[PDB]
């Protein structure tokens, strides 16, 4: 099990102690408030009224919580995943990233508290 | 396990099949968008900028996801709970409710998709 | 969780901290060597070559591990159960018992090391 | 979650769908009756009164259930394991074998019904 924070101003993303292996079933629960620039802040689901202007994950709103599993493409996490299995041939360490446009994280603020654990399978 | 919708305009709240027993460990994951009256919609965490004007749950923002186990006070759920254990002497059927001011659920819209399951204890 | 030893001479049976509730899913693992009289010892499955001369559990060999959920009838356990759901209307505390004949427990020796834990559901 | 039979006369061992990884936690429940030659059968714990004439697992009775993880030395399984964590540097596929002497499996009979599953870590 892993528990830490993901800073919005972290373009590199926060690496976790979890390593997803084929067949694993995980569960994620994220909370907190972050911002992709503006003064106000949004939840893990992001800003639904802001358009996709070249985010790292086009399957989630700007300011939403996404993740990389090893060397895979970005994967939507949002509020979290419940007893979830990854697509075929996806394996590696889980890495939580704040969904924002590359090279803009500079003005970001806030963070997300995230819990990750492997369920029984 | 349980999975269903929780309407923001349901003052009575949505009842689930889950019944929390002493010692049980549960996990919740909530997603979706709802509104406590206005036009825009907030996540399960609610509206952090909206002041508490008499919510059924004072430990959560307006438009946040709360719950009631049996017939206790409202307990914050927000984005969800991760391998969580209720306080002492708390037990009964789990009821999900939209955190709003009593008698105002009229102009509410949207809903939350919620998953509930018990983890090994 | 619960971990303890069930004595073969204990006619009343060992009472665990596990309280089975409707819907629950449990897993049991039993090991060790015990006897229903002789100098020989058998595993949690009991002695397959000994007739039923009035055992508290007729669906399990003599010298085998059984249990009673609350105030129900004896239920076979043996080596243990894997993610197991109790029959309809079965609920209560869990008591582990060495399968023998009422009043004969006197000359019994040995014990069973048993682990019981509520599983995910 | 694997479930199958471990034939007694199968020397090379029964290969399961499980691929244990570092940090993993598993639970095993073995049941049934087998034999290493005689006409009488023993449980997953084996025959406690038969000496070691060159077993493949010197830490478990002859006729007991053992397993090999990747390229490790045989490990006693017996009645099973409860929320068990493999030793340091132990990883790979799982192979359940009937503990015996190399080349004698010829006259073995019976098998063990076994369940394997990863618990929430
Ligand atoms: O020509 C323009 C038109 C609208 C506009 C507003 C705007 C633009 C961006 C923005 O946040 C930026 O978003 C990107 C990536 O998503 C990056 O994170 C930047 O660092 C952020 O500053 C905000 Cl908060 C506002 C605007 C205003 C009102 C309604 C809609 C918009 S829109 O851009 O979404 O269309 C800015 C320019 Cl230059
Ligand atoms: O005298 C007033 C001053 C401001 C004001 C705005 C307001 C108030 C409430 C509100 O949502 C209501 O919230 C309650 C429960 O929390 C209930 O759900 C009602 O049905 C909702 O209408 C909204 Cl959307 C707006 C106002 C405007 C701008 C900034 C802040 C506020 S305030 O919320 O702080 O009051 C309304 C009145 Cl009458
Ligand atoms: O007519 C009979 C013929 C043989 C016989 C032997 C026997 C009986 C009991 C026994 O263990 C006792 O079992 C009872 C209840 O199950 C109680 O637990 C006592 O405390 C125990 O001592 C044993 Cl180990 C043996 C016998 C002898 C040789 C082979 C098989 C048997 S048999 O019992 O399987 O028939 C008893 C009777 Cl009545
Ligand atoms: O000189 C002897 C004296 C007793 C004896 C009995 C015996 C030996 C082996 C056996 O099964 C064999 O076990 C080996 C592996 O350990 C292998 O599986 C063979 O294929 C099997 O045939 C049986 Cl069923 C019986 C015996 C009897 C009672 C108690 C102890 C023993 S002993 O094994 O210690 O000797 C065999 C010989 Cl050669
Ligand atoms: Ca930015
Ligand atoms: Ca309202
Ligand atoms: Ca007896
Ligand atoms: Ca043999």
How many A/D residue pairs have CB atoms within 8 Å? 22
Residue D4 backbone dihedrals phi, psi, to 5 degrees: -165, -160
Buried/exposed code over C43-54 (b: 16+ C-beta within 10 A; e: otherwise): bbbbbeeeeeee
DSSP structure string for A55-97 = -S-TTS-BT-EEEEETT---EE-TTEEEEE-PPTT--EEEEEE
* Beta carbons within 8 Å of C33's beta carbon, 6+ residues apart: C41, C42, C43, C110, D45, D48
Method: X-ray
**CB of D65 within 8 A of CB of D6?**
yes
Mutate to test the pocket of ligand 4, among D9, D38, D53 (most ligand atoms within 8 A of CB): D53
Q: What is the 3-state secondary structure (H, E, C) of B6-70?
A: EECCCCCCEEEEEEECCCCEEEEEEEEEEECCCCCCECCCCECCCCCCCCCCCCCCECCEEEEEC
**Distance separating the N- and C-terminal Cα atoms of chain A:** 15
**CB of D4 within 8 A of CB of D84?**
no
Which residue numbers come right before each break in chain B (C to N over 2.5 Å)? none
Closest CA to B93 of B30, B26, B10, B45: B26
Chain C residue with minimal CA distance to B22? Answer: C19
Closest CA to A91 of A66, A63, A108, A68: A68
* Beta carbons within 8 Å of A104's beta carbon, 6+ residues apart: A36, A37
Q: Encoding tokens for residue B55?
A: 């919510």
How many A from CA of A46 to the centre of ligand 1? 14
**CB of D81 within 8 A of CB of D36?**
no
d(C-alpha A116, C-alpha C81), whole Å: 28
What is the residue with the minimal CA distance to atom 11 of ligand 3?
A: C37
**Residues in a beta bridge with B76:** B66
Domains and CATH numbers, chain B: 1-121 (2.60.120.430)
Closest CA to C81 of D30, D112, D24, D84: D30
Resolution in A: 2.9
**CB of B48 within 8 A of CB of A110?**
no
Buried/exposed code over C83-92 (b: 16+ C-beta within 10 A; e: otherwise): beebeeeebe
d(C-alpha A40, C-alpha D113), whole Å: 59
CA distances from D20 to B119, C7, C28, C52, D24 (A): 21, 34, 21, 42, 6
- Where do we find the tokens 């940090």? D23
In short, whether A100's Cβ falls inside 6 Å of ligand 1 is: yes
Interface test with A, best of B33, B43, B48, B78 (most A CBs within 10 A): B43
Please report residues of C whose CB lies closer than 8 A to that of D30: 79
What is the residue with the minimal CA distance to atom 25 of ligand 2?
A: B38
- Where do we find the tokens 């009673």? C68
* Beta carbons within 8 Å of A55's beta carbon, 6+ residues apart: A62, A99, A100, A101
Beta-strand pair C92-98/C26-31: unpaired
- Where do we find the tokens 């202007």? A53
Chain B residue with minimal CA distance to A80? Answer: B29
d(C-alpha C29, C-alpha D27), whole Å: 9
CA distances from D104 to A38, D10, D118 (A): 75, 10, 33
Query: DSSP class of residue C60?
Result: S
For C88, the 3-state DSSP assignment is coil
Distance from CA of B10 to the nearest CA of A (A): 22
């Amino acid at each position: 099990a892993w528990k830490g924070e993901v800073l919005a101003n972290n373009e590199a993303g926060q690496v976790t102690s979890i390593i997803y292996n084929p067949g694993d079933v995980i569960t994620i629960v994220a909370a907190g408030w972050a911002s992709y620039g503006p003064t106000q802040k949004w939840g893990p689901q992001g800003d639904r009224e802001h358009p996709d202007q070249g985010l790292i994950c086009h399957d989630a709103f700007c300011g939403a919580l996404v993740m990389k599993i090893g060397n895979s493409g970005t994967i939507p996490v949002n509020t979290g995943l419940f007893r979830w299995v990854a697509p075929n041939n996806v394996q590696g360490a889980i890495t939580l990233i704040y969904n924002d446009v590359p090279g803009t994280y500079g003005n970001n603020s806030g963070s997300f508290s995230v819990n990750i654990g492997k369920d029984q399978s």
